[PDB]
Every structure is written in C-alpha cells, then in structure tokens.
Design a protein around this ligand. Structure first.
Ligand code: ALD
Ligand code: CL
Ligand code: NA
Ligand code: NA
Lengths: 305, 306
C-alpha cells in the first residue's frame, strides 16, 4: 500500500543526454541514433533573442560551431538542420545506448516524467502534467533547456517534451520532439504569459479512486449525479468538463471500488461545494490532479519496465 | 523557478537490480561487484514467519538453493553469508554496471529516492523521508522487498535503505545495507506498530525558506521567538524538537534570504496557529516536511526572488 508521485525509471533516457554548446550558450541535447536534438534558440545571442530570425542565424553556422559532448567525449557534428523550434545535429556516431523510442505529442491532462539536466548531466527526475493552459509546473534553473519529458511502455520510451523557457509566473513552456510548442508560446524574448489554468477533473477522480483503494473513504456518500449536472458544477469551479470518454476510461476503477463515476462525481461535487472540513485525502489538503487513470492503475498494480 | 518532489535519476541503481528466489519466495536483490544483497526473509517458509530462526534456516541451504536472475541471465551463487537482517550472496560475475557507491546509515529527517522494483525490474522512482518514528511512507506492493533507497550527490550512489516490511498503518520498515533495521522493528510477523509520528520541524523551516527564495513572503511576521519558547509551542502540534544543530544547519538559507532562523520559527508558530486561510505555499495547503535543508539548496536557485 501507499501512494506516491512516482516517475518512470530514468535510466534509458539518462544514456541519451549530451551537452550542446554554440557560442557562449550551453544547454542539453538528446542523442538518439546519429542525431542530437536541442532547442533552436541555442544559436541565439541575447540581442538575437529579442527578435530572432532563425533561418538567417542558422546559415551563418558551420558544423564545427556546434560543440557536442557526451560525458567526456566530443561528438563530431556532420550536419545541421532545423525542424520547427528544434535543431537537429547529425553526428558521426550512432548512440549505442539508444533505447527503443518514438516521438509522441501529448494532450492536456496527460502526465510524464521529466529528467532535469544541466551541462548534459542528469540532475533529477520528477512527474509532471501538461496543464490545460499548456504549461507545466516544473522545477528548472538556468541551463535546464533541452531537458526532456517522457513516458515508458514495456521497453519503448515515448518522448513528449523538450524544455525551452520559463514564464513570468514561474511555470514552464516547451515543445514536442518535432519542435512544435505546447501552447500559444514562441521562442523569442517577447511579452508572454500563462493563461488562466483549470483543474483536470478526470485526474482528480482517478486520485479519489486511488484514495479509496488505499482506505481513505470519508468523502464517499450515498448520492449520484448526471454528467450534465456535474459539468455545471465543474464550470463553476474552473474544472475541465468531464466527457463520456473520461467516464469510460475510469470504468475499471469504478468496477473495482464499487463507486460509479457519477457516484464519485457526487463526492467531488460535495468536496467542491463544501471543502474538506479539515480532513485530508492521501495526505493532501488539496484535490490532486496530476495522476491520470493509467497512473493510478499502474502504481496500484506494480507494472514494471 | 518551481519546486517539486525531485528524485535522483535512477539509472545507476536500475543496473544493479536483480531477482532472488529461494523456495517459493521471490524478491529483489542489489548486485554490486560480485555480491548480491537481499532481505534474509527470502529463506522463510509460510509455516514459520512468526519466529524464524534464521541461523537454522540458512545452514540448511546450499549455494544452488538461491536462484539469482539478472534480466535474462542466471547468476551462479558461489557463497552466502548473513549480516544482521541482510543476506549476502557471492556470485561468480562482478556486475559490469556497478556504479561508484557507498553504504550510509541515515538519521530521521533525512530524505532519499526509492526505486520500487518487482521481480528485479524497476516500476518507478519517488522521494521518501525517514520519519521520526523510523518508518517511511512509501508505495510498495507484494514482492517489493529488496527495493532500495539512495542518494546520488556528486556521482556517488549512497545506498541507505532496503525494504523489508509493511506495518498495519500502511507505512514501511526496512534496514540499512548492513542489515540493521531502522527503528525497533524485527523481520518477524509478530505484532508490531509504529510509534506516534511527528513532523520534521527543521524540514518545514527549510521548505519555508524555499518558498521565500522562490518569491513568496505572505506568511512572515514581525515577531521572533526564543528557541525554547518555539519548542514549547511546536510540541503541542506534534512537531519534533528543534535543536541548535538544526538552527546551525539552516544558517545558509537564513543568509541567502535575510530571514533569521528564529524569525522563521516565529512565522511557523503563527502558521500552526492560523492555517493558510485559503492560500498555498509552493503548491501545498499543508506544511511540507520531506524536504531537507540540503534538498532545498540542491533544487533552489542561489539567488532569491526578492
Ligand atoms: C516483501 O516483499 C514483503 C513486502 C511488503 C510491502 C508486502 N514483506 C513481507 O512480506 C514481510 C515479511 C516478514 C517476514 C518481514 N511481512 C510483512 O511486511 C507483513 C505484512 C504483509 C503480510 C503484508 N507485516 C508484518 O508482519 O508486520 C508485523 C505485524 C504483525 C501482526 C500485526 C501487525 C504487524
Ligand atoms: Cl543522515
Ligand atoms: Na456518492
Ligand atoms: Na550501517
């Protein structure tokens, strides 16, 4: 028993992290097969970052202007190209530690593990969610750009996030590994802000199921509701709408615990309307929304990789 | 910016995890150099879990009664010995993935990463703290025994915990890597219970300093306190006593933020009295006590958001 914010084991990703330096800028790169992926703003000076013309800045660079270091070994760059907001540096050696992997783009509300890195060296690992406002509440300091987020399935690493920037409220923005930003953000030093966020309803419900599985039941009640009635409450409390697909996805947990989703929605309805009355759930005084239904099933059944 | 429960990258430990089987019992082992470490209760049988005589159980085993599997490879056991509550199986192959490592026994309040494993394969990684009552609040299922806790400050893995058991409140108990339990617990299924737990005061103060570093001051006040008056109040909320050692350890965070330690103590006193009035601190509505002063300096900027 027990329930913790749990990240995937990071070893398969650790073996892919390298240091990329261009001019005075050093950040992290991801070395897979014979290509190193990193943020394209590595080629910028501070002057450039105000209003960068990335097409123009890139032609001015040669393969020897990119210094790529895997541990204490320099990698020789033999080509360079841009894909959206990601730079792709072809190197002369395929990474022998390349895991089975694919690039995926995730949806808001989905969770992933972040391997925070500095100077090409992994430093920490933690679990995040893509927020509805397309930010992540990460923990990043200067030099963390190029750190990546991922999920694992059996032996396949699904890379979903590359870190690019911090917004004024202290939350973070980045791209998929094909260089497309999550959210309405750009890689230039202009006025940008996180939009108003909302709470991920289906994940709160998943975590209430985790609580019941771990013996925390005080919030259960005799009542049920309907999707329409509950979604009017969700809107009121800046919760994401609950769809029928969400209900279907929670089906397993409903069957296991004997609490129908709309039954649990009646519990969440009451928690939103009344609060927790001084009590806690799984050690939290807030309604936690960064566990997905899959995360709950995976942790409570001990799936391995 | 930001503040997360941050674990160490687990790869160095993943490369050491193996499966150990004796009889019908399978759990995890830790393969370092030519030795596999695992909980000695792998040699128990179902009928004899209350009062196992481990010396008598072990003398009846040969090396080939232990099946050690590293991924898809069977390792050959060529010797065995018991050290306290850990079994040490000598194998015929040194682990080529052995990191630089050491064994350290930790004190209550210290934190570490756990790599939860089943059948020698990793499931996930998370942060824990050694509670004042010598338990940890982990996430462990059947077969998780032999999973380990560790830190990796400066590219050396310090192993500090090996998982052995779950107590009735759902919390967890285990040993250091020399096999000595944390706390008064024994590897027997006789009735045992964790002591009343308390909050790790020095860690709460560290986390309040982290909040200031990251730009939040709403919880501070104009007051101060003596150390003794603080402890008289904090103990009424089941907080651990704050010692002069703890005050000294908080010095660097006090210096970076300009908030004297006993002034932060006065802030904590008021928070215990008032709650948060609908506010949060670093994304929490409770006072967090599983970040150490060392953890805050590890994760936070050296420059305060003034
Ligand atoms: C090993 O994988 C397993 C891990 C647990 C998380 C399940 N450990 C054990 O099975 C362990 C073996 C004994 C010999 C140390 N037993 C326990 O952990 C046991 C609970 C299990 C059966 C779920 N706990 C236990 O016996 O605590 C003592 C006790 C006894 C009676 C009443 C209260 C407490
Ligand atoms: Cl310690
Ligand atoms: Na109900
Ligand atoms: Na020791």
């Amino acid at each position: 028993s027990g329930f913790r914010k749990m990240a995937f084991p990071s070893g398969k990703v650790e073996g892919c992290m390298v240091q990329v330096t261009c001019g005075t800028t050093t950040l992290n790169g991801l070395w897979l097969d014979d290509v190193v992926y990193c943020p394209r703003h590595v080629i910028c000076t501070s002057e450039d970052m105000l209003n960068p013309n990335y097409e123009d800045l890139l032609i001015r660079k040669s393969n020897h202007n990119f210094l790529v270091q895997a541990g204490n070994v320099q990698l020789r760059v033999i080509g360079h190209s841009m894909q959206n907001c990601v730079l792709k540096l072809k190197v002369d050696t395929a990474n022998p530690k390349t895991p089975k992997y694919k690039f995926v783009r995730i949806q808001p509300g989905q969770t992933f593990s972040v391997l925070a890195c500095y100077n090409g060296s992994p430093s920490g690992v933690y679990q995040c969610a893509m927020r509805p406002n397309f930010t992540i509440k990460g923990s990043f300091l200067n030099g963390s750009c190029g750190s990546v987020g991922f999920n694992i399935d059996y032996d396949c690493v699904s890379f979903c996030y590359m870190h690019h920037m911090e917004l004024p409220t202290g939350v973070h923005a980045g791209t998929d590994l094909e260089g497309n930003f999550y959210g309405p953000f750009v890689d230039r030093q202009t006025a940008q802000a996180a939009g108003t966020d909302t709470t991920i309803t289906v994940n709160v419900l998943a975590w209430l199921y985790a609580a019941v599985i771990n013996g925390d039941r005080w919030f259960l009640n005799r009542f049920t509701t309907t999707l329409n009635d509950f979604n009017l409450v969700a809107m009121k409390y800046n919760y994401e709408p609950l769809t029928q697909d969400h209900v279907d996805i929670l089906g397993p947990l409903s069957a296991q615990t004997g609490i129908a989703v709309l039954d649990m929605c009646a519990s969440l309805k009451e928690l939103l309307q009344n609060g927790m009355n001084g009590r806690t759930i799984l050690g939290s005084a807030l309604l936690e929304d960064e566990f997905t239904p899959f995360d709950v099933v995976r942790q409570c059944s001990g799936v391995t990789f």
